[PDB]
Amino acid sequence: GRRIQGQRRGRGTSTFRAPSHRYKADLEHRKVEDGDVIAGTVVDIEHDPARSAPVAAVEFEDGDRRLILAPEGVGVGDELQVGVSAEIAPGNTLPLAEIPEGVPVCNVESSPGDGGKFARASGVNAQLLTHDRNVAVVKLPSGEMKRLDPQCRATIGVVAGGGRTDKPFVKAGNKHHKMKARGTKWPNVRGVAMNAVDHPFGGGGRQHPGKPKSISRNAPPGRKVGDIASKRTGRGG
Amino acid sequence: GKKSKATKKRLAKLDNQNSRVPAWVMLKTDRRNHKRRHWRRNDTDE
Amino acid sequence: PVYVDFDVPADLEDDALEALEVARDTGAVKKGTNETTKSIERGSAELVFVAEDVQPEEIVMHIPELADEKGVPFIFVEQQDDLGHAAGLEVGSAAAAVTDAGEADADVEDIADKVEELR
Amino acid sequence: ARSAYSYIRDAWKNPGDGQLAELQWQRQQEWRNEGAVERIERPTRLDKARSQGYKAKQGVIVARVSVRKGSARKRRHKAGRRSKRQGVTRITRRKDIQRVAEERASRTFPNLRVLNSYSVGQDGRQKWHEVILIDPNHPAIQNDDDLSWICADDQADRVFRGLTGAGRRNRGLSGKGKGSEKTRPSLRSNGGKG
RNA sequence: GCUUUACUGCAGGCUGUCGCUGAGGACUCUCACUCCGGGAGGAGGACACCGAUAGCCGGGCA
RNA sequence: ACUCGUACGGUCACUGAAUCCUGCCCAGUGCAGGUAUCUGAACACCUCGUACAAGAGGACGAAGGACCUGUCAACGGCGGG
RNA sequence: CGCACGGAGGCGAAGAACCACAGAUUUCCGAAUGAGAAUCUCUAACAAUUGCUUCGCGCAAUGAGGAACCCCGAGAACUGAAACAUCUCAGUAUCGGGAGGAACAGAAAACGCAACGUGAUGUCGUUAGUAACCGCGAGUGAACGCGAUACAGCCCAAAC
Ligand SMILES: [Cl-]
Ligand SMILES: [Cl-]
Ligand SMILES: [Cl-]
Ligand SMILES: [K+]
Ligand SMILES: [Mg+2]
Ligand SMILES: [Mg+2]
Ligand SMILES: [Mg+2]
Ligand SMILES: [Mg+2]
Ligand SMILES: [Mg+2]
Numbered sequence: 001g002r003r004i005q006g007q008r009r010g011r012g013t014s015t016f017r018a019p020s021h022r023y024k025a026d027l028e029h030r031k032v033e034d035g036d037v038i039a040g041t042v043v044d045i046e047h048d049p050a051r052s053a054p055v056a057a058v059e060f061e062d063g064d065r066r067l068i069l070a071p072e073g074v075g076v077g078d079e080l081q082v083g084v085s086a087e088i089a090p091g092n093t094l095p096l097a098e099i100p101e102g103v104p105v106c107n108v109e110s111s112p113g114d115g116g117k118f119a120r121a122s123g124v125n126a127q128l129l130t131h132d133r134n135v136a137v138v139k140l141p142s143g144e145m146k147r148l149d150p151q152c153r154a155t156i157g158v159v160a161g162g163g164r165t166d167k168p169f170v171k172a173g174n175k176h177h178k179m180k181a182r183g184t185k186w187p188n189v190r191g192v193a194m195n196a197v198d199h200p201f202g203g204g205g206r207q208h209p210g211k212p213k214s215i216s217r218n219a220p221p222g223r224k225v226g227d228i229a230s231k232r233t234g235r236g237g
Numbered sequence: 238g239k240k241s242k243a244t245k246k247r248l249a250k251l252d253n254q255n256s257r258v259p260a261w262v263m264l265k266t267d268r269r270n271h272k273r274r275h276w277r278r279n280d281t282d283e
Numbered sequence: 284p285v286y287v288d289f290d291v292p293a294d295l296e297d298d299a300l301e302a303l304e305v306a307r308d309t310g311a312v313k314k315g316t317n318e319t320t321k322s323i324e325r326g327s328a329e330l331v332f333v334a335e336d337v338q339p340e341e342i343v344m345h346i347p348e349l350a351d352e353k354g355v356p357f358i359f360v361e362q363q364d365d366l367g368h369a370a371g372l373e374v375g376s377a378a379a380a381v382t383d384a385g386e387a388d389a390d391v392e393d394i395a396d397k398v399e400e401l402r
Numbered sequence: 403a404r405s406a407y408s409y410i411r412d413a414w415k416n417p418g419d420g421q422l423a424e425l426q427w428q429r430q431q432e433w434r435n436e437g438a439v440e441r442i443e444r445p446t447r448l449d450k451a452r453s454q455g456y457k458a459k460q461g462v463i464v465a466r467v468s469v470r471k472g473s474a475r476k477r478r479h480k481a482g483r484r485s486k487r488q489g490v491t492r493i494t495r496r497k498d499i500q501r502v503a504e505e506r507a508s509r510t511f512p513n514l515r516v517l518n519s520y521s522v523g524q525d526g527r528q529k530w531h532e533v534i535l536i537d538p539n540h541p542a543i544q545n546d547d548d549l550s551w552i553c554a555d556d557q558a559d560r561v562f563r564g565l566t567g568a569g570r571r572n573r574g575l576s577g578k579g580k581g582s583e584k585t586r587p588s589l590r591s592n593g594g595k596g
Numbered sequence: 597g598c599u600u601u602a603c604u605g606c607a608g609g610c611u612g613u614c615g616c617u618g619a620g621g622a623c624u625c626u627c628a629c630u631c632c633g634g635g636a637g638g639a640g641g642a643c644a645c646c647g648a649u650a651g652c653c654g655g656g657c658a
Numbered sequence: 659a660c661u662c663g664u665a666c667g668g669u670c671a672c673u674g675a676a677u678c679c680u681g682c683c684c685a686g687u688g689c690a691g692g693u694a695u696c697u698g699a700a701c702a703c704c705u706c707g708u709a710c711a712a713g714a715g716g717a718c719g720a721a722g723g724a725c726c727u728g729u730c731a732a733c734g735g736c737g738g739g
Numbered sequence: 740c741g742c743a744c745g746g747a748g749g750c751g752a753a754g755a756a757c758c759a760c761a762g763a764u765u766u767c768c769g770a771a772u773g774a775g776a777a778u779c780u781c782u783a784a785c786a787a788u789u790g791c792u793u794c795g796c797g798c799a800a801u802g803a804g805g806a807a808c809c810c811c812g813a814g815a816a817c818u819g820a821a822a823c824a825u826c827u828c829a830g831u832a833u834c835g836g837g838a839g840g841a842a843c844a845g846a847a848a849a850c851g852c853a854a855c856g857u858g859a860u861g862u863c864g865u866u867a868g869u870a871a872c873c874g875c876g877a878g879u880g881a882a883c884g885c886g887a888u889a890c891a892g893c894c895c896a897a898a899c
């Protein structure tokens with residue numbers, strides 16, 4: 001047959017690429033040596049094309065103008081601090097060791113100094129729970145208990161733009177506009193609506209898959225479609 | 238279209254190649270321009 | 284570095300090279316690793332010198348273990364060019380050997396004894 | 403008596419034993435951070451180099467080359483192929499890693515000609531070989547009675563034509579009798595059956 | 597051309613084993629190696645990656 | 659490549675606005691988890707064999723399979739008497 | 740005073756034309772090399788990679804072409820087997836790299852008419868469709884030797 005859509009993706013052609021040239025900034029945490037004496041004033045609140053959530057423009061003491069991942073409540077004029085001895089106020093970035101337990105946190109690092117990996121999407125947050133000299137247990141937005149290094153930096157507060165998922169797209173055109181700002185091919189044609197040559201579920205006189213949908217993990221690209229290594233399917237039971 | 242200096246020289250040559258076989262060559266050889274090119278009927282390069 | 288098991292002090296190295304300079308003008312010296320090795324094997328070597336900046340280390344690697352089973356005393360010099368200048372060459376030398384000293388026999392004997400005390 | 407050279411030789415008979423085991427463990431850390439072809443002032447194996455034709459003279463260059471370990475880096479067939487020709491994984495190349503190393507060295511030095519090469523070890527993913535190259539245009543070599551043969555016009559690109567030592571061995575030309583029916587005088591004259 | 601529990605194979609995935617690979621049937625360490633850090637340094641660590649081989653799955657492809 | 663992206667994400671599929679709803683079946687097939695025991699290759703190891711080798715057998719036993727469980731908005735099924 | 744027999748005119752005994760050898764001139768693009776460009780342009784140029792080095796592009800090298808031949812790598816399928824998978828077509832077609840006027844090979848860790856024998860290597864004739872391979876099917880297929888051609892033997896590493 002012909003290569004399936006998921007295989008065309010990997011080649012990284014224009015249709016599948018993200019409009020990177022239209023993106024604003026790669027929202028990472030600032031680099032401090034030690035001492036904490038790095039603070040800044042919020043100049044503007046901009047829209048970020050990459051994540052459909054707002055981003056805050058901050059001007060630091062040493063003359064550095066950088067866009068930061070905006071938590072909720074952060075406005076123009078507000079002073080944000082980045083470092084070890086930073087104040088435990090929403091919008092400040094300090095390592096997990098210095099942040100008290102039971103406090104909602106965002107833009108958490110995986111490895112110390114990476115700039116932030118977890119809890120970055122609209123309105124989500126990570127929850128810092130247990131402390132130790134070796135481990136800081138953080139509960140990520142998926143409900144997973146992630147054991148991290150207490151030296152991993154994070155920003156206090158929930159991410160801004162909460163409740164975006166609450167309002168329906170209503171029409172196809174609204175989806176179109178959102179998708180044009182992302183690295184995704186849209187609309188989605190069902191495999192079951194294609195020809196046998198194009199997809200494992202293609203063909204037939206009527207529309208239905210040709211085999212069961214639950215495919216093995218060991219399946220090769222071109223065959224790994226439908227329900228990938230499903231532990232279970234359905235709602236009931 | 239916009240022609241470059243070189244393209245202009247080439248078009249110039251093609252126009253010159255389009256002139257007839259002089260009257261005296263007919264008398265010297267005692268009796269055909271095989272490269273007769275029209276602007277509409279024929280096509281040049283580039 | 285891999286063949287070096289002891290560090291020789293700057294003062295002892297100064298003494299050693301000065302003793303080598305008067306060994307070429309009076310007695311006899313062998314210049315170059317091949318000639319130093321044959322000096323140890325034949326037993327004619329009184330004191331053998333080895334440079335520490337030899338790249339590759341293979342060229343000189345064998346001198347310590349060979350000199351130990353032939354009873355020949357050895358001393359490490361930090362630089363290759365200093366050993367070559369001491370032997371009387373325009374070029375450097377990875378290894379040199381004093382094949383029977385001369386008017387330095389007392390000094391060489393002290394250097395041999397100072398090295399054994401330094402393991 | 404034994405030469406100093408014989409001790410470099412004896413050390414290299416077992417590169418995983420003795421002082422050499424420690425030396426290689428150290429050197430390879432620096433080598434892995436080095437390039438594909440690195441010119442070195444002095445050969446790692448003096449005995450082997452001199453034995454192969456090296457001289458501490460002007461116009462004699464040495465270079466360490468790293469080539470990857472393993473079989474062929476082959477692409478799977480994009481058209482109709484019978485089962486016998488459908489392989490990817492078990493296919494190995496006909497030229498050995500030493501020969502690949504020599505060619506990569508000769509490309510880096512377009513003016514020089516390959517004299518010979520030798521192995522200087524390997525780790526888990528790559529092999530290192532040191533290639534002795536010669537300048538056919540330097541008068542220091544043109545007057546050398548032992549090396550001036552390499553200056554001749556027919557010795558141009560000798561490595562790319564298999565005229566090198568590792569070339570001739572890989573071409574199956576070692577044996578003068580039985581087994582070399584399809585190798586001598588050339589693989590091509592014998593219909594590529596060698 | 598297309599399908600599949602047709603025949604035979606080939607990629608790919610999973611898994612054991614050998615090499616890289618080191619010190620003191622479960623374990624400790626650090627020095628290779630990997631990743632994070634601008635750096636200092638941190639995490640991991642003889643595993644993983646990679647090379648080789650073996651068993652299983654394998655119309656994704658011939 | 660996705661990705662100047664991080665689960666309110668994005669990948670892979672099915673169904674196809676709203677409204678009222680979406681029953682029963684896990685035996686087969688698929689996927690997934692488990693597993694006393696059974697089966698399960700090669701290297702190393704043991705026995706036999708060979709002045710060596712081929713080779714024969716053994717011991718150990720990974721994934722996988724047997725076996726057990728979960729799962730149908732997973733492929734599908736919902737009859738005769 | 741070309742092909743090319745015209746008109747006008749000119750050159751040639753100051754020996755032209757014409758031919759041989761040697762030299763002068765030899766635009767621009769082109770490996771194309773200061774940089775860019777559909778043969779042009781912009782403000783001193785071995786660009787790039789190398790060797791030597793007075794460490795300065797100072798001295799050199801490479802690049803690209805050529806009818807096929809040659810050498811080193813990558814390597815099909817139609818086809819044959821009256822199907823087809825091993826096999827065959829075939830190491831062929833085609834592809835990548837490279838030399839020369841020819842290439843390659845070459846002075847035995849050879850042969851093994853087993854010898855009290857031969858004596859570097861190509862190649863030609865033969866050995867022979869022999870030995871050998873092979874769903875032991877279809878097919879595949881040498882060598883030693885011999886008769887010829889031409890003949891040529893040497894240099895390092897190490898010991899000292
Ligand atoms: Cl979306
Ligand atoms: Cl070459
Ligand atoms: Cl004979
Ligand atoms: K075929
Ligand atoms: Mg970012
Ligand atoms: Mg788009
Ligand atoms: Mg659709
Ligand atoms: Mg259709
Ligand atoms: Mg299909």
Ligand SMILES: [Mg+2]
Pocket residue numbers: 207
């Ligand atoms: Mg339908």
Ligand SMILES: [Mg+2]
Pocket residue numbers: 207208
């Ligand atoms: Mg349907």
Ligand SMILES: [Mg+2]
Pocket residue numbers: none
């Ligand atoms: Mg006109």
Ligand SMILES: [Mg+2]
Pocket residue numbers: 587588591843
């Ligand atoms: Mg030939």
Ligand SMILES: [Mg+2]
Pocket residue numbers: none
């Ligand atoms: Mg990195």
Ligand SMILES: [Mg+2]
Pocket residue numbers: none
């Ligand atoms: Mg098929």
Ligand SMILES: [Mg+2]
Pocket residue numbers: none
């Ligand atoms: Mg130019």
Ligand SMILES: [Mg+2]
Pocket residue numbers: none
């Ligand atoms: Mg047929």
Ligand SMILES: [Mg+2]
Pocket residue numbers: 876
């Ligand atoms: Mg038949």
Ligand SMILES: [Mg+2]
Pocket residue numbers: 879
């Ligand atoms: Mg054949």
Ligand SMILES: [Mg+2]
Pocket residue numbers: 580882883
């Ligand atoms: Mg024979």
Ligand code: NA
Pocket residue numbers: 276277278279280281
């Ligand atoms: Na026209």
Ligand code: NA
Pocket residue numbers: 508509511512513514515516559
């Ligand atoms: Na070259």
Ligand code: NA
Pocket residue numbers: 595596
């Ligand atoms: Na063969």
Ligand code: NA
Pocket residue numbers: 597
């Ligand atoms: Na068709």
Ligand code: NA
Pocket residue numbers: 684685
């Ligand atoms: Na069932």
